[model samples]
Target: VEFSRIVRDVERLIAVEKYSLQGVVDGDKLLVVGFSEGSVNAYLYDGGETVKLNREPINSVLDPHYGVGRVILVRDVSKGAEQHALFKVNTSRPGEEQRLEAVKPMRILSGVDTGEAVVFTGATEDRVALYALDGGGLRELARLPGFGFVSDIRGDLIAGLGFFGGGRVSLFTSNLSSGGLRVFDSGEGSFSSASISPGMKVTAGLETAREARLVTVDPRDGSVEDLELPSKDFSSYRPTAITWLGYLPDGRLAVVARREGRSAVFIDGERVEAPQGNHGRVVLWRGKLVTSHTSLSTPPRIVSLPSGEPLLEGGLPEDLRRSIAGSRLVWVESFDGSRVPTYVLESGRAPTPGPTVVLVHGGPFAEDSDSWDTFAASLAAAGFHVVMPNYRGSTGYGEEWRLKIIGDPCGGELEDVSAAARWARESGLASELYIMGYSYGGYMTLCALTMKPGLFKAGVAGASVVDWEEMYELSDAAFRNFIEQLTGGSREIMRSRSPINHVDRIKEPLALIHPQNDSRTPLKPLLRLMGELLARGKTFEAHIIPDAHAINTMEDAVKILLPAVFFLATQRER
Candidate 1:
């Protein structure tokens, strides 16, 4: 494989600027975050035309209310460190911004703009708390026990989900005026999504061990009841997870439910006919339903639901589009007879039983679905098939499947990944196998090479977790809490699961790509691993980027992706 083909494909895939619906500004206008002009910026999409809102690029935008006059832009002031600062831009006067000075620099988890009060959840060096900025000033509403996200804000009640204990989430409600907090936990499972209803009750999506269901909570009495919708199709659809839920202006409940890796939109229990892929939150605009759409073949774009026509879309070159043959969902039986849902992307150019990469996903909690992945697409364009396994601890697969990874980071999930590699070879999809991943997926690559050496021809680990002990020490409050939950607060497990502890077992060629400023998986530990490799006479290559974990610009994207593709292509030629 010529390295130029891989480089061209990676460029085309990353160069396509993507757009996501941030909020519905009015009947004819929508607030969107667009990755165009080689940077992330906010735009006002009004009547088929877009006006740039922020003068400079932003990391993201706070979820704005319908007809809101101003937009709150979230920008990471500390590069990829995730210390975000909020800027307010008036919709009428674009390109002008007023930085909210009251809110100090912190990791902004989630927030909402009600035009009057901007309520958000942020994690500071000291604590994770909910704060509201209004006419009075910025006040800490309540100090949360752990990481929390403001899901929805009603007239006087703010609803959200929080990780209070043991990695399980609970439903939390606070008064917008008094700031008193109420937390409701259903001991059965975790509350994944929560929103205040028109009637002032908290509507939550509860994910149990086996399935997910909707329920209503009375904030006053802390009473719980099953929420019954109007349509039976949603109930029959049997979603394993709820992406987002809210009450529309028309008093109808809008829900986006997910089964497998794909999601469907529901309005008052009626399934809206959307494109064959995952969708974002649904909004009623101009007497029609609109939402963001994406799939393996299609990049993220705003489309009118039911009719499935694009309102805004990123252009994908025809040649690049044709490089992806197709994708499918397969269940590979893992070690203990557990079925692992895996998404397979066949290359249009690669021959049958050719070079393949078991592209692992990060967020041991995140799933590899039919969603568009630039890395997988670039690999396919470069004549390699991609296998994405939704190993244990991956969401959209029920709470049991997701919770299994807790306290056993590299144990069963690594087995599931090994099962995928074996499935790829035994099922005749791969003549030779390799491994690649970033973040948690990158951690998986290291685990696979260290624990099951020679299972892959070579491995590329990007932004990987080298040592859990070192990472925990270098982590922030939110990350420290996450590490504690993942490791069950065991120091022994932290040491045992760390790849740096077992680097002596690695037997295959390895490539390490990391961001120098990455805080989650610090480069300091990776540097020690490289030192160990050098001392032990191991064959490895390493490249460090100047930014943090997040890739915002094309320059950063190319810097990270090109190296992985070139390394894999070179290995394929060998």
Candidate 2:
């Protein structure tokens, strides 16, 4: 009953990069900045000495007047214990070596924490709050209403987007004086990041198929403007990381647009070709643009523009990069005929295709794209073709695909995955397939095995739900509402779709993994399934993770995976 059983823990790394301006006026000082996980950091890049300013991570940095010898950085810090605090750090000394001595406690929100912060104006306290970053410390800026998480912050403006449910972007302007919040713009589609020019004008960037768009907005009135640019050809494929890249001094936008295995810069709507891999944080120094690029075959390099040459080159750890090399990467069409991206890694030539292990992603609603997945890679290295599909319900596509899974979770969605397996077989991807899932994916795995047991040789359900009936009863009010909506609010349909009702039809070997402390999916379903299997004299393996919420921690993942892997390896595939 270890808490680690239910959750899969993930480690996040924050990358720091320092840029020195060569020829711009008064551009001798180096600007040291970093991004923690996805958060930003600011520091003094004086010669070889780097001094960290604030304890929190920064999202944006700006220096308006050069003669003032002051730099402003907007940082995102934990607010109290429950919320996030957004603060502005204005310093005249190099790095915060001198200012850190006078650090004092400031008032933020009562219970809420700031997620991201940015500078809107100058360098005075009141100006720092609105127009200037003067003598005042970080002030309470604004809070986005209805939205709990803020995605992108730029200048004095912040962008909020829906994460799980739907695609909607809302812009909020922070009034630092009273900490008053106001809605600037709420638009369709999801935006990952935003940037503002020195003129108080704002622009937001969004990822679409093949290309990314920069949406310009007037912060004062929320008027919208569109700038269409050529989408990066990722090997004639769509770019996945249309993520936030910093802005240029000439009012041009810079982004890390990918093309196949390489990343290039699109400055002011023009393409600047560079060495391949993942590139991010494109910024302006003096007049030249500086950015960083990294990939599996190469380590990260900080490169300067005009000539597009690397100034600083570094490689990833040999073990990490070598381990990732030779991993199989492929994309296949799902049941709905959508191209689902997938990857696999195997240590050596497989004996009997090495027991096909299908890893169903938790967010059946989220798409598995070009990002790296450690669990899948590790299993592949251990001799498994860890199959993942961006099924019909997954995101990254437009509204049509995401909404398709709403009323038909157990029906078409299940078939789409079955179609994935069939496609894999037809494409010679695997000789045998075993299903493994967590959370909603675990629920899908159960439904798939019971409804179409012939498709999979055996299956593993982790942090899963076995009975929709008991689930409905035990689920929280909010979840009940969601389930009702997802099942069209029909109790009969919900019952029909529940895997518990059809478990008697399952004949394949099964392994169930659940955490006793999982409040999200709860433990009742797992207990019931175990009980039913025992009564029916059905042979199955079950493991309970102790003291874990839904699969989050790595220990929880390993606990479930180790036993499940053993069970799958021992079972014979039909």
Candidate 3:
């Protein structure tokens, strides 16, 4: 394979800007965030035309309701530190913004605009709290026990989901006027999503060890009841996870549920034939259902639901699309007999039993679904099959599977990754294997090199977790607590699990990629790791991106991606 062709494919895949439905302003107006002109910005889609709303690129838009006059833009002020500020843009006056000066800089997790007030969950240096901004100024409605998000606000009621304790989530409700808060925990499962119904009941999706079901929590008396939709098709669908659910303005319950990685959409219990992929929140627009759709082979696009036609989509060149021949979901048997869910991408240009990469996913808490990933696509375009393992601790599987990685970070999950590599070679899908990952996946790369040497010819680690003890000392309140939970509050486990302590065991060439100003995974520890590698005479290469952790711009994306691709291609040549 020619190196230039690989670069071209990477550029085209990363350059194609995506569009997502944010909200519906009225019968004719819809709010969307589009990547165009090399930056991400908000737009108003009316009469089949789009009008840019923000003068500059924005990170995201707060959820807007029907007939709302304005939308709130969330922008990061501290590069990738996630310290965001809120800006309001009026529907009539485009490109004009009024900053919400009353709210100080903080990490904005989630929020909703009700025209009367903006209810949101934010994390500061001190704590994670829920606040309401209105005529009375910003008021602290409640202090969450851990990470939380504002799901919906109706009249004087607010509903949300929070990690109260024990790796389980609790459904929390608060009064917008009285600041009275209540938390409800399910003994069987965790609450995934919640919304306030017209009858003032908190309808939520609960996920147990195997399946997901809908339930209603009466905020008045703290009573819980199973909710059954009228449609029989939804009843038998048997989804493993609930992506999103809400009560539309027309009194119909809209839900997007997933079985493996692909999801199905339902409105009023009737299944809507949406595009083949996962979908975002559903909104009612001009008497039609609208939402965002994406898949492993498709970039994100806003489409009219039921019809499954694109309303606003980015154009993917034919050649780039052809590079991705196909994708599939397979289960790989691990060392402990646990079947690990894996997503495999086959390259149209690569030969059978050719070079393959075990592209592990980040967020030990996140999952590799039927979703679009630029890194995986670029690797396939460069004539390599990609194997993404949803190791233990990944969501969308179930509560038991997701919580398995806790207190044992690299122990069982590493075995799952190694098993995936072995399965790839044994199944005649790969002649040689490479490993690549970012964040926690990056941490896995380091662990594989140190613990299970020679399994992969080369490895790429991006923004990886190097030293847990050092990172914990430099972490904030939120991350500090998370490190404790993941390490089981043990100093010995934190020391032994960290890859930085065992750098001498590495046997393969390694490539490191990191953002200079990444707050989540700071650069200081990476600097120390490089020094250790140099002293040990280990074969390694490193690239430090100029920007922060967030890749909102095309330039930032290229800076971080190009190096990893080039390094992997070089190793394949050897």
Candidate 4:
């Protein structure tokens, strides 16, 4: 999603067969996917080499002529600095033996092509900018210094959103011509998304706060419209994006907005029914809504337009069909009387007290909803009732609720999960509640087993953040920045929220899993905690998946789960 998180011109979920497409220059054929060791993963249009792309920290690649020809857009973070540069690559149509021929990037040291023709920002330091081939030469816009960072680009306009002292991001726009620079100066909070549409010739932005609202700008007249998407679900309905807003081929305004749970792709006159499921990445391709959708049993698929619905019925796998333990959405009352949205799965032919397992989500920033989960379904198949809570601080519920744990990631949010555990026990679902989760959810499991030692019987945490400070320092910069923004500054907050601080109080048996290449919650730090558990002679199982990334570790969790479930099951009587 970071490739072009704030897309202004594109519509629809970009896909190539089963793989997701990254960059599209002209129409569709153009694509960019970053691979290992920093190589550009050429999707469909792999320029028959002789064309060589050097392994650099690539920012973006653009092919204006509809993927016919290409250029290598590389970003150099060499000195820990974000600098932008370009190289002209020559492409020879798939030649003899089908070997693609293309030129090596001719580096652009500094400056813009159309800066003389238009009154855009002058040559400063190139962070990242967009260039288009117009009137024989290359015209560049919005690649200058101090204007923050460009989020989106259009025919003649570019928008930038950057942060200041605190964590909030501010929006800035430039027409690249003599329009000068206009700033939205949203002093309160950071914007979720923005876009520039061709048909409407308008740039749209979204701000989610105590109440959600829309911001549209007409670069033609320099007019700004700050209008509400219109909703009374004050604490709920918050439009996170303007899916596609523009005039139809016939010419008119057709806009699509997305809130926490679903997206509505309103086709000009008639509203296309937003299907059920956790559907997202909604795009207006050609004219219909094409998206990447998934349900409890549906592996996230490329949902074609017109059909609009996921496969009619995807209950479970053949081997797992008989052991089907399906999940349903429910709301559980929280400690503060706030209703916490939750998902509870029933075990297949299992008894009422069939070993209850409460699964928590990570990212205290991310939420749980309908999705085909390999792990959750796996647990359910093993005859375990699973409970997952969309704790406060999770998205989909609106701004106010999401910000509930703003300065405190593990504070009240973890309590909401504990409430879910309580609810599951009271509802006659979980006779003996155990806990599990990965990443942030994993971190919560650690806290739960320690802070509320008597509440659960066993816990399984994957890629758990044992020491938040160690993770903050050892993880990727983006993750570190996210933590900084969340807590403003750390060390104290990091140490306090970390599970390592109170692992001594852990009374329940635990299973810890960490991947080899996980940077967000680096695996290295947790091993020491594991050593301590071993030193204490505590009953626990530890797994370090080889060569597995954070996501891959989660995806291939059956390897990790089989043993954890076996251990948890063995302790059913304890």
Candidate 5:
């Protein structure tokens, strides 16, 4: 259906849930763990109904014990990469807020971003530990003499697999009473991903050629068993990722498998075809599976398998969906020879097109998934052909492609957008093009105007970082450390790559949108960019949303929407 509409009432009826690992289901009660607004929240569900257990956001939640009426959650006052206190939520207490018990925070010993404590809960929930910030934290744990990195951990047992620096899979089991690591065995090839079943049966996806296999590792003796599938039918498609779906009550292991371009349901070596698209997660609820599915032609679908049929599907509002239904989605190949996926929402029929709006993503490291994106769909509704690209540095493509644009920065990565524009023009997707981005995407947008002037008609940037140098100077200690890791060691490399240093090279009309209270990519960069543009007799407009933090509130959305549409329309007029 080219003209599909997702009704607002229907979308709202589905009660969108976010970032939670589904837990055991008890009668009408379905338990799920989620971290939202800085606190761990345990949601209680009555059949298909869901309810939040805690008022505050949660850090993390372990397996719930309905029999004992308790669920453990890690909570604290500080937020954002800060140390939080661990707490146990007693469901037995119906009316009072839960209390927290202080535990040792992570102590990083050797890295630039040090003294940060991280608490992780193992599979059993009984093996919770504070990974000391110091390097000596894992000294008591058993270690393989040859292996360097710990690959995966199940219960008290941890496994190490070598890749980036070496290639081998080593296993270790910790004594819950006394924390100690022991080396098991060393095997060849890289372990891309790992998952542990209820019986401590470990499943590791070993990277072989382009395809990965699901192999079982013995927890006691470290013997390996290759779980042969009914068919080698997935030979053309490589298994890029795998996650544990926990164990079903029937003693079957559930796993969500991701191939090159499709997602599948693998239950005890049996594969079931799911909705064809880029899938994010699969959660189990009383023998039923729920997951988020996205595709180039379709909007995000939150579907559930109750009786094997799609029981319910949640999507964006109807008006918005109808507005974007006419748009076309395509994959653009970047200058670096990387295949960057993009969705182009064009107006009018073929042979005649409209102006293009290049919308970049936030995490320079994130992908433009087919998930429900309100802004992108809204822009398409406003009659602008929006092109959203998953650039070279985007995730979901594996580690190698992710780190490609990191060191090169604007050097080759900037060429990626230019290539995307060229592809749009050649493919007759749009006659004219404009650029827009948010956060890291904003930085890329500004760079597009400066680095490749005259290519774009106009540009709009929101919550952007124009000056990496000034940002480093004003940013917090933690952020500065993060930048160091992202840009490598040379400050000179960062300077040369920053868009602020080359603002004078920009020739296109520009609109800069930023939030006044964004601590991450603060207002300072935008202010500095404005000053530089004014000093150089360059004409540009700037919009600042007060009392907002880096695309947090709806007000921030409204602030940029009008100005952005106006800017793109102006480009089309000229």
Candidate 6:
């Protein structure tokens, strides 16, 4: 089909809950954690029914290493209003139906023989602790916060790297061979990527002059090797984070270099390409590959081989399949003379010059990439050009670019967003433009609409931060600590960064999309934005999703997107 028709009805995408939280091998049956019908639940990768693990609200799953048929459940309990307890589920019992058997926790990771150690940052903010199974209770192992955040926990050797201290500020692995109950200081600056290896105390990734240089650290002998990977483009990537994939049961190292927007898997330097999309939790389950793979159109699937296909969970409607065009990754110069990466997607075979929709990614820590995005695809199908910008604070770019944004939170980030919009207009993609974002991206859309004023014709913000001060007060403790870590000193410094204070500047039709139970951005600030919008009498639309906070389901996406396109199409004049 030369000209495919993109489906605007999003119900077909979220009709069946197919997103996977956790996908692991349970012998012949693939274990999975899923979110559907406004609740988080667990099930097998089969066509049978799923189980919600009961009582406590289950958020995450901890799978056993090696060939152990064990399941560790991270269930929320009433310890600290909203706290989590780690438990081992004994899946030994079988039920009447051919579905997931009666799920029960056999042992919790608090103490002994319960399970392996999990690394996490505590209320202390800077402190990083490794929690493990003790005889009757939990035992804490000392590492570094000098270590900050730990990505992967269960590795042969523990490696710790520099702290970007904030975005998503994270720490690489550490050398625990002899260091201390206290973590030793690694060469400073935010360490973006680090992977542990089977052969002793080795960590990779370091920041040098706006670029990531692949380096090796061996604390035992006090010698560091500034080496280069055999791969050429490896060094050019943002900190080339070497990830320790634990032990592959064969004592071999399974590593994935932290490459920018690239989805291929590299095992010990040899590259084995993965299907292009966002991939993680990759493991060599019993020799075959076990991974959580998904794209804009592809729902989360747990596949053993490229051929080991399970029943795919979610996708665009059959008519919508192949209708939307793929994306193109391009480089553009932004505000600070830095090169920003942007993605553009067109509607169909025969293009139409119309309003260009720019999507600002939330994570000042995240990057927008070449993946299947239902929202973007739907917009293209609806006769609009779509642009997604990685911006300055996004990951995948070197740690230098990422860490710089901490100085001015939305400073360079919004500049990059405007740069993408300008690129669209100058390239004749779309003179009339509509901009939207979620989370931090939502913050960006709000800021660009007000700060840049004329840059965007219409805007949509989802789960956004109208006031950073209010957000910090209501956000989770961990996130609160991260906020302090990044933009420290006076809380007043944040007051000026908010969009609520400058709402008077916005003159375009805007839509505010938020979820019902969002603890992250909460509802107060969103209401505050609405109240302000009402006072100014600015054109606006509001949709509060009843199902979940933000846009988790396809139904939610359709709600915001359909109205968004309507506003842009109707108000085409500047």
Best by lDDT: 3
Question: What TM-score, to 2 decimals, does candidate 3 have?
Answer: 0.84
Q: Score each candidate by Cα lDDT.
A: 0.87, 0.55, 0.88, 0.56, 0.58, 0.59
The lDDT-based order of candidates, best leading, equals 3, 1, 6, 5, 4, 2
Give the Cα error of residue 485 in candidate 3, in Å.
6.6
Task: Give the TM-score comparing model 2 with the true structure, all chains together.
Answer: 0.71
Instruction: Between candidates 4 and 5, name the one with more favorable TM-score.
Output: 5
TM agreement with the true structure for every prediction: 0.84, 0.71, 0.84, 0.66, 0.70, 0.69
| Evaluation by TM-score, superior candidate among 3 and 6 | 3
User: With candidate 1 superimposed using the best TM-score fit, by how many Å does residue 233's alpha carbon deviate from the native?
Assistant: 1.5
Better of 2 and 6 by lDDT: 6
> How displaced is residue 142 in candidate 3, in Å?
6.3
Residues 434-468 of candidate 5 have per-residue lDDT tens digits of 88888888888898999899988888887788877
lDDT for each residue of candidate 2 in 279-324, tens digit (9 for 90 to 100): 6666666456666655433334466775657655433334434434
Q: How many clashes (backbone atoms < 3 Å, residues ≥3 apart in a chain or on different chains) does model 1 have?
A: 0
Error of 3 at 429 (Å): 3.0
Residues 1-574 of candidate 4: C-alpha lDDT, one tens digit per residue: 1212111101111111121223223233323333332223333323221222333335444422223344334444344244334443333332112111131122323222222221222223434333333334544544433435444554556555544335565666666544345656455645555555554344444555644455666655555667333342322334564433433323333455555444555443344555555554444344454555555544454454557544212222354544445567778888787899887767664578667888888777776766655566656656677787898888767778888876776778878889998988888887788899887788888889878889998898886778867767776788888778776586788788877877688887898877777566576778788877877777788878765433233234344555566656667656
Tell me the number of clashing residue pairs for each predicted model.
0, 41, 0, 10, 16, 18
What's the lDDT of the predicted structure labeled candidate 4?
Answer: 0.56
What's the C-alpha lDDT at position 277 in model 2?
48
CA error at residue 269 for candidate 1, angstroms: 1.2
